[PDB]
Write a protein that binds this DNA or RNA. Structure first.
Ligand SMILES: Nc1ncnc2c1ncn2[C@H]1CC[C@@H](COP(=O)(O)OP(=O)(O)O)O1
Ligand SMILES: [Ca+2]
Ligand SMILES: [Ca+2]
Ligand SMILES: [Ca+2]
Ligand SMILES: [Ca+2]
Length: 379
DNA sequence: GTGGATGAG
DNA sequence: CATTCTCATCCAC
């Protein structure tokens, strides 16, 4: 396969610099509550880190311009514009978070090679960096295939910049793991292509186990408990003991990843399968409060159903108690689903408060720290 | 289907 | 560690 991973540069900060170009010459960070969730490259050179506490950021970089990024409407809107632009190149585009997309270019590459003539194959040319500086063998089929990929990735980024004013990086490789690992080698606004003989050099470069996809905090804790603390430890661990510890498909998967093998296909994401709205806070402790919060969250949600075309057939309420989340969910009554000029707030809040009182014993003190509404089962 | 664990940015 | 504010998959129930 030829796979591309496209990753937008400091995405939230970029959207803000487009929303307000008075900002693009200054160090800029996007704040959510007490965290600077991301910042532009001017800020990073001054020592601002992703997800940095506001106190640390004020002390380190008092010049930092901070814009509030708690409302994701604009980021979400730009995000979908990006994947839909990419869907002009191939029908199958896999989203990861708001600012990453994978595309399987192998169909398109194969078409381009068929169209190619004898004299200008000579004469195929790289777009962007070649990982680890290795030289292209224009006589190697796989090399040619990846170079054509790099040219497409270049056209993708050109379309993005022209149509949307957005800059990002791309990585081109034989699978999703590798494409995503290589896209960030040169940052920001650059692209790199991974040729197969230097794949092993790329996986060697990983310093920590949590740098493998799908190995989060909990999985790393499990592996730590089996004596596996590093990537080489994982490569080196008995497959059969690991299968009898994590399960067959998880063990085989995460072990393949550590040798750079990833056969997962690129899957079309499409529109969200669920919309939610949420807010975190120090204390909710009353039903009256937690009602007003829900009404607010629900109001935002209803604006988004309206946009979208499909109707939710279920609603989910989510809480976080002081000191993970809890949810209940239930079906939305058929008569409420036909809403779109009527009063849907009242029966919807009625349902959500029943869900709330099911989870929270209001006859006794409580103390929430997050509330989310969610619409799912979308038809 | 429902609700919790765990992954992604 | 999560934290933020989302969105997704897996699986016992
Ligand atoms: N739990 C999390 N882990 C990692 N990133 C997160 C998390 N929560 C929010 N984010 C945001 C913070 C940075 C952002 C992705 O990077 P961004 O696009 O801003 O910069 P880059 O140019 O480095 O790709 O994802
Ligand atoms: Ca990014
Ligand atoms: Ca990681
Ligand atoms: Ca989907
Ligand atoms: Ca995480």
């Amino acid at each position: 396969r030829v796979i591309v991973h496209v990753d937008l540069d400091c995405f939230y900060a970029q959207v803000e610099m487009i929303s307000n170009p008075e900002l693009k010459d200054k160090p800029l960070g996007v704040q959510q509550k007490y965290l600077v969730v991301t910042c532009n490259y001017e800020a990073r050179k001054l020592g601002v880190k992703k997800l940095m506490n506001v106190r640390d950021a004020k002390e380190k970089c008092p010049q930092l311009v901070l814009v509030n990024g708690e409302d994701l409407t604009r980021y979400r809107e730009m995000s979908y514009k990006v994947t839909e632009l990419l869907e002009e190149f191939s029908p199958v585009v896999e989203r990861l978070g708001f600012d990453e997309n994978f595309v399987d270019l192998t169909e398109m590459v194969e078409k381009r090679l068929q169209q190619l003539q004898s004299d200008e194959l000579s004469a195929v040319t790289v777009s962007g960096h070649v990982y680890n500086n290795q030289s292209i063998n224009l006589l190697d089929v796989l090399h040619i295939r990846l170079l054509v990929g790099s040219q497409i990735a270049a056209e993708m980024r050109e379309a993005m910049y022209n149509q949307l004013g957005l800059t990002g990086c791309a990585g081109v490789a034989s699978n999703k793991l590798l494409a995503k690992l290589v896209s960030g080698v040169f940052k920001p606004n650059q692209q790199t292509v991974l040729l197969p003989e230097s794949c092993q050099h790329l996986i060697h470069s990983l310093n920590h186990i949590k740098e493998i996809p799908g190995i989060g905090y909990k999985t790393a804790k499990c592996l730590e408990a089996l004596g596996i603390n590093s990537v080489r430890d994982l490569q080196t661990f008995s497959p059969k003991i690991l299968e009898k510890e994590l399960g067959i498909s998880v063990a085989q998967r995460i072990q393949k990843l550590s040798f750079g093998e990833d056969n997962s296909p690129v899957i079309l994401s499409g529109p969200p399968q669920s919309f939610s709205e949420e807010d975190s806070f120090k204390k909710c402790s009353s039903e009256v409060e937690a009602k007003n919060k829900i009404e607010e969250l629900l109001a935002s949600l209803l604006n988004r159903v309206c946009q979208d075309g499909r109707k939710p057939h279920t609603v989910r309420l989510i809480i976080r108690r002081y000191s993970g989340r809890e949810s209940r969910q239930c079906p939305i009554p058929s008569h409420v689903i036909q809403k779109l000029n009527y009063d849907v707030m009242t029966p919807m809040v009625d349902i959500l408060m029943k869900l709330f009182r099911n989870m929270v014993n209001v006859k006794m003190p409580f103390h929430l720290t997050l509330l989310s509404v969610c619409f799912c089962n979308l038809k």
